[PDB]
Amino acid sequence: QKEKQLEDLRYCREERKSLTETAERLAEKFEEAKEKQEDLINRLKRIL
Amino acid sequence: QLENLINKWSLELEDQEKHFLQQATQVNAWDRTLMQNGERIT
């Protein structure tokens, strides 16, 4: 039971790390998309 | 002499019973905590 719990704890640590890295990559893409949208809005404001 | 030997073995048996319950009982407490932590991890 201890060996199985140690393996589950390793799996949960790896999944937590993977989830953290995917959240970081999603946050980067969200800020890039927001910056591009602000640039488009600023271009629209100039045209208007 | 026989009565002194019987009294000695009775005291040794009661001490061994107490030691056995401590060795058990503690493992059973750890097993319950391990099971609860396994459910929480799951």
Side-chain angles (χ1 to χ4, degrees), chain A residues 29-45:
Chain A
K29 285 182 180 181
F30 181 85
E31 288 300 337
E32 284 188 21
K34 179 181 153 215
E35 188 178 14
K36 286 169 185 154
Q37 183 64 12
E38 281 183 8
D39 273 345
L40 284 171
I41 288 167
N42 285 329
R43 184 177 168 185
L44 265 155
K45 284 172 181 172

Side-chain angles (χ1 to χ4, degrees), chain A residues 14 22 38:
Chain A
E14 288 177 8
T22 59
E38 281 183 8

Side-chain angles (χ1 to χ4, degrees), chain B residues 1-35:
Chain B
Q1 285 181 336
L2 286 168
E3 186 178 6
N4 289 345
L5 188 66
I6 290 165
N7 289 339
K8 179 178 170 179
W9 291 337
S10 296
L11 288 172
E12 286 175 350
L13 184 65
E14 187 178 3
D15 187 67
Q16 289 305 305
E17 182 181 2
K18 183 182 177 185
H19 278 305
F20 183 81
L21 288 171
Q22 287 176 351
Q23 286 182 333
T25 302
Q26 187 174 22
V27 172
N28 283 323
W30 292 331
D31 242 30
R32 289 176 183 192
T33 300
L34 187 148
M35 189 175 71

